[PDB]
Structure formats: structure tokens, C-alpha cells
Write an enzyme that holds these catalytic residues in place. Structure first.
Site, PDB file in Angstrom:
ATOM      1  N   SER A   1      -6.879  -9.353  61.431  1.00  0.00           N
ATOM      2  CA  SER A   1      -6.596 -10.687  61.511  1.00  0.00           C
ATOM      3  C   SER A   1      -7.659 -11.696  61.963  1.00  0.00           C
ATOM      4  CB  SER A   1      -5.825 -10.734  62.884  1.00  0.00           C
ATOM      5  OG  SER A   1      -6.631 -10.596  64.174  1.00  0.00           O
TER       6      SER A   1
ATOM      7  N   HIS B   1      -2.473  -2.506  62.567  1.00  0.00           N
ATOM      8  CA  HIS B   1      -3.035  -3.462  63.303  1.00  0.00           C
ATOM      9  C   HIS B   1      -2.164  -4.197  64.320  1.00  0.00           C
ATOM     10  CE1 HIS B   1      -5.908  -6.379  64.828  1.00  0.00           C
ATOM     11  NE2 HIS B   1      -5.767  -7.469  63.680  1.00  0.00           N
TER      12      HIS B   1
ATOM     13  N   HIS C   1     -12.399   6.068  72.235  1.00  0.00           N
ATOM     14  CA  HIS C   1     -12.912   4.994  71.774  1.00  0.00           C
ATOM     15  C   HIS C   1     -14.350   5.217  70.988  1.00  0.00           C
ATOM     16  CE1 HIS C   1     -14.133   0.713  70.500  1.00  0.00           C
ATOM     17  NE2 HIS C   1     -13.011   0.088  71.006  1.00  0.00           N
TER      18      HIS C   1
ATOM     19  N   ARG D   1      -9.785  -4.092  79.952  1.00  0.00           N
ATOM     20  CA  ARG D   1      -8.653  -4.770  79.681  1.00  0.00           C
ATOM     21  C   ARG D   1      -7.615  -3.842  79.985  1.00  0.00           C
ATOM     22  NH1 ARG D   1      -9.358  -7.044  73.818  1.00  0.00           N
ATOM     23  NH2 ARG D   1      -9.525  -4.784  73.716  1.00  0.00           N
TER      24      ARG D   1
ATOM     25  N   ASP E   1      -3.941  -1.204  75.497  1.00  0.00           N
ATOM     26  CA  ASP E   1      -2.690  -1.347  74.558  1.00  0.00           C
ATOM     27  C   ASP E   1      -1.883  -0.237  75.236  1.00  0.00           C
ATOM     28  OD1 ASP E   1      -3.782  -1.665  71.256  1.00  0.00           O
ATOM     29  OD2 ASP E   1      -3.113  -3.243  72.692  1.00  0.00           O
TER      30      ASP E   1
ATOM     31  N   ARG F   1      -4.873 -13.925  70.153  1.00  0.00           N
ATOM     32  CA  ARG F   1      -5.876 -13.889  69.062  1.00  0.00           C
ATOM     33  C   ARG F   1      -6.225 -15.115  68.468  1.00  0.00           C
ATOM     34  NH1 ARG F   1      -7.948  -8.807  67.310  1.00  0.00           N
ATOM     35  NH2 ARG F   1      -7.663  -8.595  69.685  1.00  0.00           N
TER      36      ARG F   1
ATOM     37  N   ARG G   1     -17.476 -14.021  49.317  1.00  0.00           N
ATOM     38  CA  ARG G   1     -17.328 -13.520  48.008  1.00  0.00           C
ATOM     39  C   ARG G   1     -18.423 -12.173  47.895  1.00  0.00           C
ATOM     40  NH1 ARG G   1     -21.054 -13.143  43.898  1.00  0.00           N
ATOM     41  NH2 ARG G   1     -20.087 -11.889  42.440  1.00  0.00           N
TER      42      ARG G   1
END
Lengths: 437, 437
Positions: B244, B274, B320, B329, B375, B401, B421
């Protein structure tokens, strides 16, 4: 009847490419294929290798290739339309997916196969018929491809839990549906917008893909249809790096289903640095048609283009950092024009810039590929057959790049490519990095 | 009244960062900051540097930082809500944009400033009220942020031709509008979906941002509001690399305007790899609440988690690859839980896994960061205050977000970052490349 069953072919081809990549990656895999600079990393990833996009490669001597089959071998090889001279986009999606050149009944297959898969949930239909005519086509095309996501098979089979090694078979099914509903969505964005909200019509399993579309756009010209068949074949694909192709890719790697990845790609192609250049040239071509007036000489546009290059402007449509000769996709739509609108004033304009421009640049330092794009030829060819409505051009590139972006989507999912996650940084990070460390 | 004028501050800060990047890039700029492998390039860009995302850096000893201000300094420093204990997302967007910590009337400013900018074109409102309840929130959230693009200032000023060095001032204006209309759109996707299509309400220039939202969601609990204020502050941003954040970035670099880039980012966040993991844990937590039953001992979940790690599964929420201690968090929403739902059965469940899990992993080889995510904590905290509707969780991460993705969007546009690019390749290309060459 007759055919050969696409999915069933692709089913076969899969394990063989799947291994080829396993050994390659076994052995040389760690072989360093380049470096990154603090400067590239501000340079929007300036000539970084980072993709593997297995449907088209830019050949610097020879334009773009849909294998090694380039431009000029495609027009030959790809089946033409049962009384036509220009290729079917059908047989081009087929090439892009297979690696092989269709047979007439491999193509006749797809056409049948797109016509049936071609249906539209009452809620996208409603959603279209109420959209405001101040909303851009490309905000509509993408709003409604997300809302079509209501219908994804993958979304669902995922939800139910298919396993890694099966993902392609349904991501396949979602792609084949999308490329069938696409004509409907855009035919209707046109019709609501520009042809006073009339009816798109019906859909005919008799006809091929581009035809049905042109027929829903409401165009009775079989010359326009065959331009449509050609246009859609040539703007299909262009390496993976470019905004619409990288976004459908990036997003599709979060296991988002093809409706959602494609809709996210148009949000990239609606971007000025990306969608809008087919236009940019037509508009230039338009002022010039005035300022230098109707039927100019080889001496007067030399004067204009020269008085343009030197007085601190640029010629929209001309130049390319890599491709060494004229882009074949100029040449394809030129060959067209020569045949079908030879004595068109504005095509006369373009074809003159072809004579004149390259030498004027080359002689005037702005060179190495002073040769024209595709984007230079197309809009002139659109406006002739009365597609004046130039905001809408971006959707026609969308419906084309679809074939190339979705046909590699099946492949990233087949070869099971990972979630795309480069490392970010930050300047303060960088300052400590390159120098302080 | 009172304030300090955000745009006018940012106006000042700009040239100074703009230079800092000019010299850095002058001098060391070519200093090689890494290499790429044939394997990384199939590895979805496995630990490539390629971004410069100037709003958040992952600190391996210390979690995520919104400068160097980490987690724990934010909760202190960021203004709390005029009778609260949890930070305002207002003052966090402000930090993300400025680099500086708001003052109460810098925040009181934004709140006033979001409430007014908070309006919705009759056609998104209509478009919502007819969407099918079989369509996912996240296909609705993104369909309607594209359709809001009808209203972009940038789209328009672009169309009229603003110049390079002005782009930020309007890309600014589009971002500040979007983050104000966001509450409305999601409050209404909720209400139509889950609260039987009722009215979202009105909007109050008195209240702060998170509040208005919770008030439109139709939640009368001032504890829930302050969870909402905390939730939105902590999921704001997370380096630039993630789906994202990279998509809003990629697409936004084709000069697409903030509505369109954000909508394209949700098409990435609706992706299973995601968006969907806040859920994944709640669901796990749910079976476990059954299989190991209500009030277990420190010995029985040790048995479960052990019989889980060793019988060839994994513990959703734990581990992690970089962060070396427990994610702050987790700790933030734990600290919350301790205060406000201490004797909750299911929070009792989570807080037990915290005791037990790390050691069970660590002892059982799956280690180095055996510590929990964010989460793992959140969904339990949502379900308590009666947000049962778990499909909708992905929108709440979206609206969060947003602050982090848009606040760096202004910056890529301010520092004038190029169209993104990277070079693609192709296997056949690669085989000739690393080894044959």
C-alpha cells in the site's frame, strides 16, 4: 466443432518453465546482475533491474518483441480476421500466454470463449448509468473494475483456501473473464459519456473481440474495426517496468485478484506521465495545422520544426533513449494510413514530419534515436474515423495493455512470484549509509 | 482565534530539505549503496534498496520511528485529546509532514481544518447507497476514492498547467481534503453494510478527527473513540516498501492525483498478503478459545502452542525478521487493554500467549524475534467494543495508513521525485545475462 483448449495447453507448458527457472536460480542464481546508487534511488529506480516480466522485451535494434517474435513477425504470423489484413488481439493474447502462435481455431476459440464470459453484474451497469459526466472515463473505468471484483473466482477460491500450486487456474479464469467484460465496460463509458447515454447493444458470439467492441461503441465502419484490431494488438505490452504494468504486478503480488490489480493499473495509466501522450501529440499536430497552415512545403515545416527545436521547445512524439531505428508501431499505423487514408490532410501532416523531423533533430543535437513513437501516429488515425473525443483515448490504451498485463499475471502466479517488497530508505538513513559507513 | 498555518510552515521547510538533497546527491550521490542478484529479481526485490520514503524508518532495536521519534516518544509528545490519554492522529499527520511535534492549536487547527474540507459529492453518496452488500468494503472504499477524483484540485491545476515547482501546494490541498472525506466514506460503508443502511449523521467542527468518525460509525463509547485515536495513530506509516505504500507511491509518480493514488493503494491493502492479518490472528485466537477452552493454565497453552509449533503449524501474530524486541505497537494496545478491558476473557487469552509463546518458540527453533506484532493485539480490542464485523477491519487500517502514505506523497511531489521506472527483464534475457555475459 473444433479447437485446442488454452488452459490445458498452459497446464502443460507450466512445469517446464517452472523447472527452467528452478535450475537457473539454482546455479547462477546468485550471479550479481548489477548495482544500485544513492542517485538511482532518488532517480525513481533509474535503470535498476528488479522484475522478470516474461511476455515482452525491448529490442534496441528491432523495437518491441512478444518473444523474439517482434512487430513485423507478428503481423505476418498472428491470424488475421477471416477476411482482413490486420491481426486479431485474440491471437495476440494467445501468443502472450503461450509463447506459441495461434491457429485459426485457437483464435476462433477465444472469440467464442470471450463472448460467453462476457456478462455484467447489474450493479456495475447501474453504477455506470448514474456516474456524472464530469467524471473522467478513466476514473469510471477503474471504479467499475474494482466493483466488478464482486465477481472474482479467485477472491473466493482463496477465501475457501486453494493451495499455492493451484493459484494460476483461477487467476486464469479471472483474467479471461475480465478481458471479456472490458469491451462492455468501456463501450458503455463511451456511450454514456459521448453518444448520449444510449444503449451499448448486445454481443455476438459470431464476431471476434475487437469487432464486438467497435460494434458496441456504435461504429459501422469495417475499416475502423480493423484499425481497432490493429490498435489493440500493438499497445498490449511493453516490458514490466512501466507504471501500469508495474502496478498491476506489485498489487497483484499481494495476492489481489485480477480485477483489483487491473483497476489499480489504470490509476497509474490515468497518470499524466503515462496515459496522456497520444493526446499530447494530436494537440500539437493541431496548433501546427493552424500556425503553419494547411498544405505546407518541405521548406516551411523545416522552418517551423527548426524554429521549434532551437527556440527552446521539443517535438512531441519524436526521440527514444534506446530504440535505434523507427519504432515498428509507428510503421504499422503508417502502413495502415497509406492504405486507407492516404490523402488525409492531417495524416499528410504526420507523414511530412516523418520526412522532415529526424534530420532536423539529428543535425541539431537532440539525437541517437530521433525516430517517432507509436503515439505520434495513432490519434490521427482515431480522429479520422470520427473518434474525436480525446479524453477517452486513455481507456483504449487501457483495454489494450490489459492483454499484456493479465497474461503475465497468470505467469507470476504460475511461477509463484513473491510479494514485492523492496527496502525503502530515508535521506538521513542514506547520509549515514553511503559515506558515513 | 489561534493557530500556525501548516501549508505556510511546510512552505518554509521545503527549500531547506530540497538543498540537503541536492548536495548529498551532488557529492556522494554516486556512492554505490548495494548490489542486485538474479535471485533478488525473482525474489520480489528481496532486500533491494530503491525508495527514499521520508516519514518512517524501521528501527531494529526500537520498533518503528516517525523520525527518530519512536513509538514511546510519540505517546508522550503528541498532543492528547483535551481530556484523554491517547494521542490524536491529527497531531501525528502533522508530525509526519513537518518533522516537528504539534502544538495544541496546531492540532486544534487541523481538526477545524478537516471538518470543513469534509464534504462529499452527491455522486459518491449515491454510488455508496446503491452498492451491493455482497461487494466487499474495500472494493467499495476504493471504487469511491477514484470517483472522488472528480474533485481533485491537482487534476485540474495540472490540466491548466501549473509548473513543476508548484506541484506540492495543490497536492497538499488534495491530501488534506482526502483525509477529511475518508471518515465519511468508511462511516458510510459501515453503516450501509453492517448497521442497516442507516444515516451516517452530520459532522462537527467542535470535535477532533477520530471522534467524528466514531460518531458517524455510530459508537457512543468514549473509550472506543480513544481506541480509535490510538489505533489511527499507530498504523499510519511503515517504511515505503510495503504494498500500500509502494503503490500509492508508484502510481502517484505518474503524476496521478492523491485520490487516485490512494485508491490504488487500497487495491494492494485489500490483498491477502497485506490487509488481512489482523483478522487472521483473531480467527486463530477464536478456534483456540474453543479447542483449549475458556480459562486455561500456563501449562495447558504451553501444551497447545508446543503441539502447534511442533506439529507443523505456526502462531499467527508472532515473529519478525528484523525487530529485536517486542513491537511497541503490541505494547501500546496492551497498555490500553490493561487499563480498560483487564478482565476480558479474550484479552486474557492474548496476554497469556505473551507470557507463554516467546519462550516456547525460542526454545523450539523459530527464533531471533519471537516477539508479537501489532496485529496480534488489535482485533481483540475491536471485538470487545463490539466491532464484530471483521471483513471491515481492512478499511480501518486503510483510513490509518492514509496519513502516512499521503504525507509522503506531498514530499515526493515537493522534492520532485521522478516517474518510477525500474528495468524489467525476462528469464531468457537473464540466462544470457548473468552467466553467458
Amino acid at each position: 466443432a473444433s479447437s485446442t483448449n488454452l488452459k490445458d495447453i498452459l497446464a502443460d507448458l507450466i512445469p517446464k518453465e517452472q523447472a527452467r527457472i528452478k535450475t537457473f536460480r539454482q546455479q547462477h542464481g546468485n550471479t550479481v546482475v548489477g548495482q544500485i546508487t544513492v542517485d538511482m534511488m532518488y532517480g525513481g529506480m533509474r535503470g535498476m533491474k528488479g522484475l522478470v516480466y516474461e511476455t515482452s522485451v525491448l529490442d534496441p535494434d528491432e523495437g518491441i518483441r512478444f518473444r523474439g517474435y517482434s512487430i513485423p513477425e507478428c503481423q505476418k504470423m498472428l491470424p488475421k480476421a477471416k477476411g482482413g489484413e490486420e491481426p486479431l488481439p485474440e491471437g495476440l493474447f494467445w501468443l502472450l500466454v503461450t509463447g506459441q502462435i495461434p491457429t485459426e481455431e485457437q483464435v476462433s476459440w477465444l472469440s467464442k470463449e470471450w463472448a460467453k464470459r462476457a456478462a455484467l453484474p447489474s450493479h456495475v451497469v447501474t453504477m455506470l448509468d448514474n456516474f456524472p459526466t464530469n467524471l473522467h472515463p478513466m476514473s469510471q473505468l477503474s471504479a467499475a473494475i474494482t466493483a466488478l471484483n464482486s465477481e472474482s473466482n479467485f477472491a473466493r477460491a482463496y477465501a475457501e483456501g486453494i493451495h499455492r500450486t493451484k493459484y494460476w487456474e483461477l487467476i486464469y479464469e479471472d483474467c479471461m473473464d475480465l478481458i471479456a467484460k472490458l469491451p462492455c465496460v468501456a463501450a458503455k463509458i463511451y456511450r454514456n459519456l459521448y453518444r448520449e447515454g444510449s444503449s451499448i447493444g448486445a454481443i455476438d458470439s459470431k464476431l471476434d473481440w475487437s469487432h464486438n467492441f467497435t460494434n458496441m461503441l456504435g461504429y459501422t465502419d469495417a475499416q475502423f474495426t480493423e484499425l481497432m484490431r490493429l490498435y489493440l494488438t500493438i499497445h498490449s505490452d511493453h516490458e514490466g517496468g512501466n507504471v501500469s504494468a508495474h502496478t498491476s504486478h506489485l498489487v497483484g503480488s499481494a495476492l489481489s485478484d485480477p480485477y483489483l490489480s487491473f483497476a489499480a493499473a489504470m490509476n497509474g495509466l490515468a497518470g499524466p506521465l503515462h496515459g496522456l501522450a497520444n493526446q499530447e501529440v494530436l494537440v500539437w499536430l493541431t496548433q501546427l495545422q493552424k500556425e503553419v497552415g494547411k498544405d505546407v512545403s518541405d521548406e516551411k515545416l523545416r522552418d517551423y520544426i527548426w524554429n521549434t527545436l532551437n527556440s527552446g521547445r521539443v517535438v512531441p512524439g519524436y526521440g527514444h533513449a534506446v530504440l535505434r531505428k523507427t519504432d515498428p508501431r509507428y510503421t504499422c499505423q503508417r502502413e495502415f494510413a497509406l492504405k486507407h487514408l492516404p490523402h488525409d490532410p492531417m495524416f499528410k501532416l504526420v507523414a511530412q514530419l516523418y520526412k522532415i523531423v529526424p534530420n532536423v533533430l539529428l543535425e541539431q543535437g537532440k539525437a541517437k534515436n530521433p525516430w517517432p513513437n507509436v503515439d505520434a501516429h495513432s490519434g490521427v488515425l482515431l480522429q479520422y474515423y470520427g473518434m474525436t473525443e480525446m479524453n477517452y483515448y486513455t481507456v483504449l490504451f487501457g483495454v489494450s495493455r490489459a492483454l499484456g498485463v493479465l497474461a503475465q499475471l497468470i505467469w507470476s502466479r504460475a511461477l509463484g512470484f513473491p510479494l514485492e517488497r523492496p527496502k525503502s530508505m530515508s535521506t538521513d538513513g542514506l547520509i549515514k549509509l553511503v559515506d558515513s559507513k
